[PDB]
Structures are given as C-alpha cells and as structure tokens.
Amino acid sequence: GSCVPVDQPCSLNTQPCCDDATCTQERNENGHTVYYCRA
Numbered sequence: 001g002s003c004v005p006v007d008q009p010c011s012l013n014t015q016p017c018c019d020d021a022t023c024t025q026e027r028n029e030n031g032h033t034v035y036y037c038r039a
Contacts (some may be wrong), residue, residue, distance in 0.1 A: 002015050003016055003017055003018040004016065004017045004018060004021070004023070004037045005018050005037065006018055006021040006037045006039040007019055007036070007037065007038070007039075008037050009037070010035050010037045011023070011035055012034055014024040014034060017038070019039045022038055022039040023035050023036070023037055024036060024037075024038050
C-alpha cells in the first residue's frame with residue numbers, strides 16, 4: 001500500500017520504500033546524516 005518514493009527521504013520507524021527500495025543512510029544539503037530510499 002503506502003510506501004516511500006525512491007530517491008526520497010525515509011525513516012526507520014516509517015513505512016518501507018517503493019519499487020522494492022531500501023532505507024539507507026545518506027547525507028543531506030546541511031551535511032547531517034539522514035535516511036533515504038534507494039531502488
């Protein structure tokens with residue numbers, strides 16, 4: 001049903017990603033650690 005779009009930020013406590021993506025650690029514009037979705 002509901003999922004996070006790939007290439008978009010996600011959360012370890014939120015719904016999974018879309019297109020069979022995975023929530024991985026990455027860097028943002030600010031430079032702090034974040035979680036994003038990768039197909």
